[PDB]
Amino acid sequence: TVRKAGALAVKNFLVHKKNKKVESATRRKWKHYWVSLKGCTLFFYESDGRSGIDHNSIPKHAVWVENSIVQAVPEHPKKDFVFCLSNSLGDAFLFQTTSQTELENWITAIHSACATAVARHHHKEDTLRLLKSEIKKLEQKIDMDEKLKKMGELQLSSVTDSKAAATILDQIFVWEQNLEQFQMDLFRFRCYLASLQGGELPNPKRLLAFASRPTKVAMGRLGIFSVSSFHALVAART
């Protein structure tokens, strides 16, 4: 049915384009919608100015939010109570609500929906246990690729064959990219887990430190360095 619904101001923020590119959305005004989270989809409804919005109302459009991240943007230069959803495709959207409490409720509801979607995917009754398990798996994968990358870097100046060296450099950059993906997934699952346990979300500054040089260059092009743009860039690769 409906997990969460409310009136929000909404603005497209980042947009996924062909060839795995993220671009900033056009400079534009906020628009108000009745936004309703059902399953793992946000439905956006416009008011006709005289009737309410119910099950027989037809949405203007819908945003699929499976495997999304939502972040408060208290740093937003002009508006309070802004949060940002970045989806699994490389898109992101800004939303403005009415208070800190309501903002936190939207973050909780969307992450809960995402957590349920992950459980659906794995056929697990225990959503909490599954999240912790996936977290453990990601930490194991991170440990391995970190170690392989460290070995590779130490090997770079010991291999005398130029083809061999070039191969190792390629691999270092593969591992670097893998680690960006893994850290993003880990942060995301920690967001989901926190939302179910009522705990605090993982530290955004810690995640950003894992952005590689090419990813930072891309964030510079976008005009935004944040968990949301980092996520959009990573998601656009898949």
Which residues bind to Ca ion, rule: CB under 5 A?
125, 178
Q: Which is nearer to Ca ion, 10 or 113 (CB)?
A: 113
Q: Which residues pair with 65 in a beta bridge?
A: none
Q: Which is nearer to Ca ion, 112 or 178 (CB)?
A: 178
Q: Which is nearer to Ca ion, 222 or 234 (CB)?
A: 234
Q: What are the backbone dihedrals phi and psi of residue 12, each rounded to the nearest 5 degrees, phi first? A: -65, 140
Q: Which is nearer to Ca ion, 94 or 207 (CB)?
A: 207
Extract the tokens encoding 194. Answer: 């926190």
Of 120, 114, 58, 118, nearest in space to 85 by CA: 114
Whether 90 and 22 have beta carbons less than 8 Å apart is answered as yes
DSSP secondary-structure letter at 70? Answer: E
Q: What is the dihedral of CA 99, 104, 108, 109, to 10 degrees?
A: 10
DSSP secondary-structure letter at 50? Answer: S
Of 9, 5, 110, nearest in space to 54 by CA: 5
Extract the tokens encoding 209. Answer: 């430190």
Extract the tokens encoding 236. Answer: 């656009």
Q: Which is nearer to Ca ion, 68 or 127 (CB)?
A: 127
> Residue type for 227, please?
V
